[PDB]
Amino acid sequence: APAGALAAVLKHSSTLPPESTQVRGYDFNRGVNYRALLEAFGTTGFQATNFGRAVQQVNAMIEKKLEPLQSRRPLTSCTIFLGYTSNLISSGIRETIRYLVQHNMVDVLVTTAGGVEEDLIKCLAPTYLGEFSLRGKELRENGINRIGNLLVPNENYCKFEDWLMPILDQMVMEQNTEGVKWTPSKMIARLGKEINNPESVYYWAQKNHIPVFSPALTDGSLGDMIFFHSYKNPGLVLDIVEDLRLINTQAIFAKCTGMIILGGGVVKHHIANANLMRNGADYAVYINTAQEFDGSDSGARPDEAVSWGXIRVDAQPVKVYADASLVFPLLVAETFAQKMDAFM
Amino acid sequence: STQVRGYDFNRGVNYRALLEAFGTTGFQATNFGRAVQQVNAMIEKKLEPLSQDEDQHADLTQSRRPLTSCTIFLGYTSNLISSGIRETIRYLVQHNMVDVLVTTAGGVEEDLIKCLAPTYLGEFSLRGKELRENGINRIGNLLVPNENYCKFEDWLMPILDQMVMEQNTEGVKWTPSKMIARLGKEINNPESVYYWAQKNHIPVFSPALTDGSLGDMIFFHSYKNPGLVLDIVEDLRLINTQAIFAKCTGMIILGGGVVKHHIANANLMRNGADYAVYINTAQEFDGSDSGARPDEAVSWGXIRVDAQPVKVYADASLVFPLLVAETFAQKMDAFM
Amino acid sequence: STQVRGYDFNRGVNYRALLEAFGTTGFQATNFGRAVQQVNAMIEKKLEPLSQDEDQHADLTQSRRPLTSCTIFLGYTSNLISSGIRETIRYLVQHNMVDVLVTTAGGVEEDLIKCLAPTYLGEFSLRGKELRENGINRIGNLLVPNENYCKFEDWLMPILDQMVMEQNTEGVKWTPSKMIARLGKEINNPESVYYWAQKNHIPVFSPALTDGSLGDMIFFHSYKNPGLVLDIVEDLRLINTQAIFAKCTGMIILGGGVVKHHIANANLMRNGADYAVYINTAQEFDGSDSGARPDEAVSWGXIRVDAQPVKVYADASLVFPLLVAETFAQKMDAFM
Amino acid sequence: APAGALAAVLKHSSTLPPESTQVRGYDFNRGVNYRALLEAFGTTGFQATNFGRAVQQVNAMIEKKLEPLQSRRPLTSCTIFLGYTSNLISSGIRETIRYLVQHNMVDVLVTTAGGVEEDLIKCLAPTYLGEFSLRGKELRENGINRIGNLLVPNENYCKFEDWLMPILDQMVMEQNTEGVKWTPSKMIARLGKEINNPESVYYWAQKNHIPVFSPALTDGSLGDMIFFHSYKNPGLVLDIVEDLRLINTQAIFAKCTGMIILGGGVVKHHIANANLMRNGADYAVYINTAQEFDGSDSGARPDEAVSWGXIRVDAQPVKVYADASLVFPLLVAETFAQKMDAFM
Ligand SMILES: NC(=O)c1ccc[n+]([C@@H]2O[C@H](COP(=O)([O-])OP(=O)(O)OC[C@H]3O[C@@H](n4cnc5c(N)ncnc54)[C@H](O)[C@@H]3O)[C@@H](O)[C@H]2O)c1
Ligand SMILES: NC(=O)c1ccc[n+]([C@@H]2O[C@H](COP(=O)([O-])OP(=O)(O)OC[C@H]3O[C@@H](n4cnc5c(N)ncnc54)[C@H](O)[C@@H]3O)[C@@H](O)[C@H]2O)c1
Ligand SMILES: NC(=O)c1ccc[n+]([C@@H]2O[C@H](COP(=O)([O-])OP(=O)(O)OC[C@H]3O[C@@H](n4cnc5c(N)ncnc54)[C@H](O)[C@@H]3O)[C@@H](O)[C@H]2O)c1
Ligand SMILES: NC(=O)c1ccc[n+]([C@@H]2O[C@H](COP(=O)([O-])OP(=O)(O)OC[C@H]3O[C@@H](n4cnc5c(N)ncnc54)[C@H](O)[C@@H]3O)[C@@H](O)[C@H]2O)c1
């Protein structure tokens, strides 16, 4: 056999360090213990191992948050920023996020406009399961709107209009006669108070003094309603400058920050950019489906953010490459939900 | 019934024939050929004259842009301005080939910064710690020295001072669109997309203008000279009006996110765009708007039911200059 | 008409209820719930008794595996055997819950090597030059020291000698399936998938068995002891026969490539599989077979027209142990 | 303004080295020069820059191949391995590959079974354009098979059967009476000789003594035909061991190797594993759409192959993340097709 060939393939190797963890999956001959099954993801490899690392990172930021020490929310030992794209509020992850907000487990929310309005609309009418392959022409003819494999009847938006128009009237009157300078976070707090329904994420956020930022709040159905309303009752102004001040000072005056970001886009960048103002987040977990090759911010690995100063150089950020509708409930089950006693 | 056949290089390298053969090559090459046809259709419609009835309806805008037979919305993600696609977009704006621009904050600031300092080529693998120690920021396989932002601060802070003054003394109600026009006028540089946009009366929408370096500067400036207000409501009125009073609309959308949905949503106000070409790398399986196929937008009324939208699944830095070569650039004489 | 609703953690951490709620959560969580239902349907059908007529048709195989009411084909890519999913697959084979296995060469050799030396956790970012200098091979975020392959060579070379002898002296016509059964018998280790496969008469198909370390060893051995023949024609006959004489078939396919097409093509011989669950990360846009949706296979007759196939778009290292927990592992008592 | 904040965002930077290339796209004010347009991809960024690097890598392997110096193919100064997945032969890239083989510009082909049979079937009947969204039930009812957005009538396979069965008879007879030990490469050479049509990739490959490897040749329509034929005329054996010997010795005895791989799977690994036998390829270009996160070989970056010894440590491998149906014709236009004079 050719000597160079044998030397290439049968190269000698170095011994790995003794802390080296061996690959091994869960053994179902033990039966089905769901806690042991989830723990075994950490030694299974590929994204299962990243999930295991994400559990560890989240548990670290919770433990730090539970250490004793233009906002009335009290400082804790670690401020947790939670960001999520709109479509995740269309999904049942809405319930997962509501739970975290209800029990004051996170401190700052960031979402796009759909992620605001659809939480409110779900208190008036439900969203239904469908399929991705349904054809647009047939859905349009029957007054049904598709979001992935979910379906929202047009009627839902008519109900939202009827609910929202009197509130927009009051907001204009308060602006003009009580001096209120409206921003997205202030409007979202008001809407959560008005929906007055404990299934709503934003009801709990305003009850618990958790601010919600959404700088492009007009890009959605709420924007449509504001548009039509402005010809009936002109005058509403929505400033985004004050809200930049508010989010950035949440980071600047924190003892510690952690970021948990579901998806990409504005929600990811806006949280990360706030944490640059303190020379970076202490903890960071990304769960998203985007890839780096197209140079996008959405698809950028956590290590790109280290180069900017958005994540501290000493941090151990983790990305899980998966649909958050699969992963986030499992993550919550092994982290926040295990510490519910401590949060109350 | 068209047969699959690729370009035969025994014919020699005849570039125009090679590009034409994408249409019969299959997979995304065929979608590229269909995108060329759709964009040439937008352009042909744009060049048709307005009848007397049509010239009445459209004219209801008080837009000082001349009105045409097809309003073209161009949307692009911040990173594409970091790329050399900035030059591709500047060309289209310089020659009035598009009517409305939508981009995120990075897509505005990095055009201006490129007039002050250049962006450099690097690699995706470069480690963050080493780059941070040297003040080098990474954008994919591109590199922006932090000094670039230091020069931006020196140039912008005086303009922010004037804007606050004009607001408090002349009653100016600032919006992202108005600010972008002002910054384009101030850069006074023919390499800038926003210089040409303001010169040609092409409006630029960016509802989350605070999400980037421009935000950092406004934040810092707020401490020395407070009061700047940026209203997003008036800009919603403006973008929606551009679609409502159009005879025909076309959408050319590079990437996903806010830029894609905001253009599509404006076109829902007229019961849908007539033409639509998407070029993005996102996939539908996660339920995202970014990854949604054009047919999802048909269910909402954002694209007309009888339109023939096309999506090309590819990095726009490869596809978009070839698309422009085969469409707008072939009709340059018409736009002058 | 089912309403979207996620699991409510105010109920506490009730794992079975949490997994059940994926079905109404949306996007790929819902596809996971539909995959659970489809696999439970395969299992229910498998446990139904054969009638007298049915027990005649099926029995035409000379397979010594007992025949059941649903033949389940399990396919998986090499990398999943490098992962801890190896343990998941071993469980199913050990308890006779699947009937036919299809994997690539890596999926065979790495199971055997794991009985000699372990694979370790690492990270995708590790640089190749540094790893090569230390004789460490990278498989994604996993690490295999080259010494692992040195031990494999010592263990396999004597078996290759016997196989060539049996071919030349006893007329044995070797095929990938026959070789894999032999290697499983030789490893004699209850942690190995192929030890259990040979013990339970579960055939293993791998038409490109030469594409990996097993190939390297056969190549080197060929110089000292020439003549080994591995016929792939007989194995084609064998896999196709398993589908033709089945009362019902189901396909569970982890990943893409040869493993996906070869199972689907065997099922075309019976005018399509009755049940089908795909779990892979590939996308359709490039025209690949890996990325093709199940509905593409319906056009060929590889999946029956009235089947309800499901694809879950996810890394199988996350999804497959949860799927097994909610399906096969709940019926363990039936398979003993 | 907070001092730490200003220090975080307005950090001082180091000067880049003077060889640093500036980002700039093609300027259409120059008009439309397609050669200048393609050259400008190298300074455009993201995958356009990777395309520019791929042009350079391919031109380097061609230049080395053109230097003066169980196979009758003569050694050149650099052996070029070309691999491609089956679906690319269904596409019009079939013509691109044919051109390279026709003019002896590459030395070794590797493809899966579909990439063999569909080149032959296209000489009997064409493939047609369709759409990805066409429904399987309606296509099946009309006897049409879908490949991505392409369509192949069932009739095509009936024509292939009629053409192929007499050839399989002769192969069995030659095995049994002339001692021929059939392998995939030998069968593919014979099929290319029999199709006798200069539109066929494999006609040119056998005319020019370019071997074709396909170790899972049974996974396709050719396998179906071999299966049905074996009950009418039993006996055919197809050995894969001899073909492993043949591909690996192409690498071992090369002066220099380059790999150009379109897609992933068996085709990618099999070429790379052959080049491990010489301690790695000198040049490597990957064009594929797969991603690394799932631990797949398909999605692995070139740097993973450096760790195995499949790519030399001193090499400068490139991956372009794109559909090869877009990129490969452009790549060929700027590399092989510019040097056609030298190849004749
Ligand atoms: N429900 C809707 O989708 C909806 C409704 C109203 C308005 N809009 C508007 O559309 C715009 C764009 O939406 P966006 O900014 O929220 O993001 P997006 O949904 O458009 O996608 C951003 C990126 O997030 C990642 N991502 C998305 N969903 C994911 C998931 N389930 N798991 C993992 N990663 C995931 C993907 O990589 C995607 O490319 C917003 O301004 C929003 O207000 C959308
Ligand atoms: N240079 C920067 O990326 C930069 C700079 C400053 C601020 N930001 C902020 O980041 C936020 C998110 O950025 P964004 O919304 O502009 O987009 P993004 O980077 O989040 O991209 C959104 C989606 O567009 C698609 N896309 C991106 N690049 C593409 C390409 N090359 N070809 C095809 N499709 C492509 C991808 O599917 C991606 O998931 C914005 O608010 C923005 O201001 C980014
Ligand atoms: N460990 C190894 O990867 C290894 C070892 C030796 C030889 N090889 C050889 O490499 C060749 C190619 O490998 P292959 O065909 O087994 O597959 P592959 O690695 O080429 O994967 C094929 C496709 O399957 C899907 N897939 C992969 N991993 C997945 C996951 N974790 N979850 C979901 N989907 C996933 C992806 O879409 C991928 O593109 C084979 O001939 C094989 O023997 C590989
Ligand atoms: N035409 C067909 O698709 C066809 C026909 C007959 C049989 N088969 C059989 O199916 C099996 C699997 O096919 P395969 O191994 O060729 O690969 P594949 O098409 O199944 O995919 C392998 C990977 O290659 C990459 N890829 C595929 N097409 C690409 C493209 N256009 N551009 C860039 N990257 C691309 C993707 O990352 C994909 O995951 C083979 O054994 C083959 O014989 C398929």
Residue numbers in the entry:
A (entry chain B), D (entry chain B): 9 to 77, 89 to 363
B (entry chain A), C (entry chain A): 28 to 363
Which of the paper's sentences describe this entry?
Hypusination is a unique post-translational modification of the eukaryotic translation factor 5A (eIF5A) that is essential for overcoming ribosome stalling at polyproline sequence stretches. The initial step of hypusination, the formation of deoxyhypusine, is catalyzed by deoxyhypusine synthase (DHS), however, the molecular details of the DHS-mediated reaction remained elusive. DHS catalyzes the transfer of the 4-aminobutyl moiety from SPD to the modifiable lysine (Lys50) of eIF5A in a NAD-dependent manner. Recently, patient-derived variants of DHS and eIF5A have been linked to rare neurodevelopmental disorders.
Furthermore, we used ambient-temperature X-ray crystallography to solve the structure of DHS trapped in the reaction transition state, in which the postulated form of deoxyhypusinated DHS is directly visible. To do so, we collected a diffraction dataset of a DHS-NAD-SPD crystal pretreated with NaBH3CN at room temperature (RT). The intermediate state structure of DHS was solved with the same packing scheme and space group as the other DHS crystal structures and was refined at 1.8 Å resolution. However, our soaking approach at RT allowed us to observe a continuous electron density extending the Lys329 side chain, suggesting that this residue has been modified to deoxyhypusine upon NaBH3CN treatment. The 4-aminobutyl moiety is covalently bound to the ε-amine group of Lys329 and stabilized by the Trp329 indole and NAD pyridine rings. Moreover, the electron density observed close to the exit of the active site tunnel likely represents DAP. These analyses therefore demonstrate the existence of the proposed intermediate and suggest that the rearrangement of the Trp327 would lead to a collision with the deoxyhypusinated Lys329 residue. Thus, the spatial restriction of the Trp327 indole ring in the wild-type DHS protein may facilitate the transfer of 4-aminobutyl moiety from Lys329 to Lys50 of eIF5A. As shown in the DHS transition-state mimic crystal structure, the SPD N6 atom is sequestered from the reduced nicotinamide of NADH. Hence, the NADH-driven reduction of the transition-state imine bond is significantly attenuated.
